[PDB]
Amino acid sequence: AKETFYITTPIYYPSGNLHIGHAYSTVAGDVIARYKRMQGYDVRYLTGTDEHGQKIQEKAQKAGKTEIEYLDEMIAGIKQLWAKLEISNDDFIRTTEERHKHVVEQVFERLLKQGDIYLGEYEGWYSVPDETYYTESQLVDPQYENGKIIGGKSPDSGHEVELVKEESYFFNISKYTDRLLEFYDQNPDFIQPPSRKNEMINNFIKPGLADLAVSRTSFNWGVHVPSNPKHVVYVWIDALVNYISALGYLSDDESLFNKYWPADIHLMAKEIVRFHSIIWPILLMALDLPLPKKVFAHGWILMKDGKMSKSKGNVVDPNILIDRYGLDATRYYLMRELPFGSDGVFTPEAFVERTNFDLANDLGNLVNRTISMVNKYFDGELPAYQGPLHELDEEMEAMALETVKSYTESMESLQFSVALSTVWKFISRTNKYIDETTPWVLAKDDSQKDMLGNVMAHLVENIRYAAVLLRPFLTHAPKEIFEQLNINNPQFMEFSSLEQYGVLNESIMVTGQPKPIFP
Ligand X SMILES: Nc1ncnc2c1ncn2[C@@H]1O[C@H](COP(=O)(O)OP(=O)(O)OP(=O)(O)O)[C@@H](O)[C@H]1O
Ligand Y SMILES: N=C(NCCCCCCNC(=N)NC(=N)Nc1ccc(Cl)cc1)NC(=N)Nc1ccc(Cl)cc1
Residue 360 is classified by DSSP as I
Helix (H) or strand (E) holding 141: strand 140-144
67 belongs to the binding site for ligand Y (CB under 6 A): no
Which residues ranging from 9 to 28 are in contact with ligand Y (CB under 6 A)? 13
Between 216 and 464, whose beta carbon lies closer to ligand Y?
216
Helix (H) or strand (E) holding 348: helix 348-354
Between 215 and 430, whose beta carbon lies closer to ligand Y?
215
Q: How far is the CB of 247 from ligand X (least distance, A)?
A: 20
Q: How far is the CB of 304 from ligand Y (least distance, A)?
A: 22
**Residue 256 contact among ligand X, ligand Y, none, beta carbon within 5 to 8 Å by kind:** none
Q: Choose, by CB under 6 A, the member of 14, 21, 48, 53 that binds ligand Y.
A: 53
Q: How far is the CB of 346 from ligand X (least distance, A)?
A: 9
Q: How far is the CB of 502 from ligand X (least distance, A)?
A: 42
**Residue 22 contact among ligand X, ligand Y, none, beta carbon within 5 to 8 Å by kind:** ligand X
Axis crossing angle, helix 449-470 with helix 393-412, rounded to the nearest 10: 0
Which residues ranging from 236 to 275 are in contact with ligand Y (CB under 6 A)? 236, 238-240, 271-272, 275
Binding site for ligand X (CB under 6 A): 10, 12-13, 15, 21-22, 24-25, 268-269, 272, 300-301, 307-312
Of the ranges 101-109, 230-238, 429-437, 460-468, which one interacts with ligand Y (CB under 6 A)?
230-238
Q: Annotated binding residue at 310?
A: yes
Q: For 261-275, what is the HEC assignment?
A: CCCCEEEEEHHHHHH
Q: Cα–chain-centroid distance for residue 114?
A: 36
| Gap between the Cα atoms of 12 and 47, Å rounded | 8
- Are residues 135 and 148 in contact, defined by beta-carbon separation less than 8 angstroms? no
DSSP string, 19-53: -HHHHHHHHHHHHHHHHHHHTT-EEEEEEEE---S
**Residue 301 contact among ligand Y, ligand X, none, beta carbon within 5 to 8 Å by kind:** ligand X
Between 128 and 441, whose beta carbon lies closer to ligand Y?
128
| Gap between the Cα atoms of 125 and 416, Å rounded | 41
Q: How far is the CB of 20 from ligand X (least distance, A)?
A: 8
232 belongs to the binding site for ligand Y (CB under 6 A): yes
| Strand 42-49 with 4-12, pairing | parallel
What contacts 24+ positions apart, CB below 8 Å, involve 106-111? 106/250, 107/237, 107/241, 107/283, 107/287, 108/169, 108/214, 108/215, 108/223, 108/225, 108/226, 108/233, 108/237, 109/225, 109/226, 109/227, 110/287, 111/171, 111/286, 111/287
50 belongs to the binding site for ligand Y (CB under 6 A): yes
Q: Choose, by CB under 6 A, the member of 52, 101, 298, 331 that binds ligand Y.
A: 52
Burial of 266 from C-beta contacts in 10 A (0-12 / 13-18 / 19+): buried
Q: How far is the CB of 464 from ligand X (least distance, A)?
A: 34
87 belongs to the binding site for ligand Y (CB under 6 A): no
Q: How far is the CB of 315 from ligand X (least distance, A)?
A: 8
392 belongs to the binding site for ligand Y (CB under 6 A): no
Question: Nearest-CA neighbor of 215 among 130, 291, 107, 290?
Answer: 107
| Strand 4-12 with 265-269, pairing | parallel
Between 131 and 182, whose beta carbon lies closer to ligand X?
131
Using CB atoms, what's the residue nearest to ligand X?
21
Residue ranges that bind ligand Y, judged by CB under 6 A:
13, 50, 52-53, 55, 222, 232, 234-236, 238-240, 271-272, 275
Q: Which residues are annotated as a binding site for ATP?
A: 310
Q: Which residues are annotated as a binding site?
A: 310
